[PDB]
């Protein structure tokens, strides 16, 4: 057994949607995709869920940031400061 880099997986890109300190994400994979995040406060408040059924989800993003992992697609990151004027 060797450390080959398999030609490997990739899940379709997400639909990013803005709200006030909140990411609505209409999402639509090919296969069951383990999504997960890390609210970068010292309060981690992570989430995990395999997604195979297309699902609009939500994420209470904080002031300092959140990150977002659409499958083995690379991890995203997001500034959600205010939007409530």
């Amino acid at each position: 057994p060797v450390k080959a880099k398999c030609i490997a997986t990739l899940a379709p890109e997400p639909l990013v949607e803005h709200k006030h300190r909140t990411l609505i994400l209409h999402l639509h994979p090919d296969h069951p995709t383990l999504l997960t995040t890390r609210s970068l406060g010292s309060d981690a408040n992570p989430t995990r869920q395999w997604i195979e059924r297309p699902t609009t989800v939500n994420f209470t993003v904080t002031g300092e940031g959140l990150e977002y992992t659409w499958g083995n697609h690379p991890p995203k990151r997001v500034w959600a400061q205010e939007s409530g004027e």
Binding site: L15, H26, H28, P54
Partner: protein, 50 residues
């Protein structure tokens, strides 16, 4: 309620009916035979996947 139809020998005027419930909604999608009273988003806008 002013249309006759002189087919046969009798002249007959019908309605207008009082029960104006169009079971169709304003916005409708249609597929082959199955009709869906769906709020289709619009031409020109529909989000991908949706």
């Amino acid at each position: 309620g002013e249309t006759p139809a002189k087919i046969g020998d009798a002249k007959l005027i019908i309605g207008p009916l009082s029960s104006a419930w169009s079971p169709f909604d304003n916005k409708v999608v249609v597929y082959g035979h199955e009709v869906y009273n769906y709020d289709f988003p619009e031409y020109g806008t529909g989000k991908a996947g949706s």
